[PDB]
Amino acid sequence: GVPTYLLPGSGQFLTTDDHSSAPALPCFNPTPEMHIPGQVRNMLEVVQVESMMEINNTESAVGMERLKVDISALTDVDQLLFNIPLDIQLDGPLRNTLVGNISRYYTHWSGSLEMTFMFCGSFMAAGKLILCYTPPGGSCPTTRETAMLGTHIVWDFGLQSSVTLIIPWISGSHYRMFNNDAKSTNANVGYVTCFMQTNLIVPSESSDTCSLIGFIAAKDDFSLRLMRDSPDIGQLDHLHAAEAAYQ
């Protein structure tokens, strides 16, 4: 026989181990493969699909109403319209998104984000918005001439309905962490703010109030690392009829 000795970790059950194991049904022939539409091979393909942000996460916004932001004509120049918290770990407009939900199975992330906004007013409605990303370090800007100093796009409503703001990967480290300490220097991304560049201008027969839908996706420079249990789901009890499977 072969002389052998057992190492530390002999007999352990590691849930991420990767070995062959004994086939319980010998000579079983699985059903032939068939082409099915929509095969996924990397989860990064899913986070590249844009999905609606819950920007109007306010009391008295119910259900579908939380997925849109209403804009009205103002009488003061350059007013703030809304801001978007960029925390994916803490609860906020980005959490329940395809990029958000998949990323919360991971601990580390890197790469650029795109926010796309679709204007859903009438054809006769006109306006210009400025959308700003502020890199981290200070407070969220409350005035347009402060927010204008960051990365921004000036959006004119027109035949093309939608504009993209890229949030470029601007970070000291290779990765950020999905950290519950949102103010940590390893976690904070900064802010997105929207201001009036001009005004929403509508004729009498159009509705005086118009909506934006915001979407977010990852770009293909995006990467995720260190898999973890997602905090999005849990159970305190057995589910209904889970017991009946033993009966």
Binding site: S20, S21, A22, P23, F28, P37, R41, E45
Partner: protein, 38 residues
């Protein structure tokens, strides 16, 4: 290491790096341009 006679007994296959994200991101019959899309 796999001495079992059935190929489904083997360890996991972590080597498939093929992607095609456009089947979810760009399912439009006429491809986008880098240029007014409509």
């Amino acid at each position: 290491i796999n001495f079992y006679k059935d190929s489904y007994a083997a360890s996991a296959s972590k080597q498939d790096f093929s992607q095609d994200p456009s089947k979810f991101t760009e399912p439009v019959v006429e491809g986008l341009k880098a240029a007014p899309v409509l």
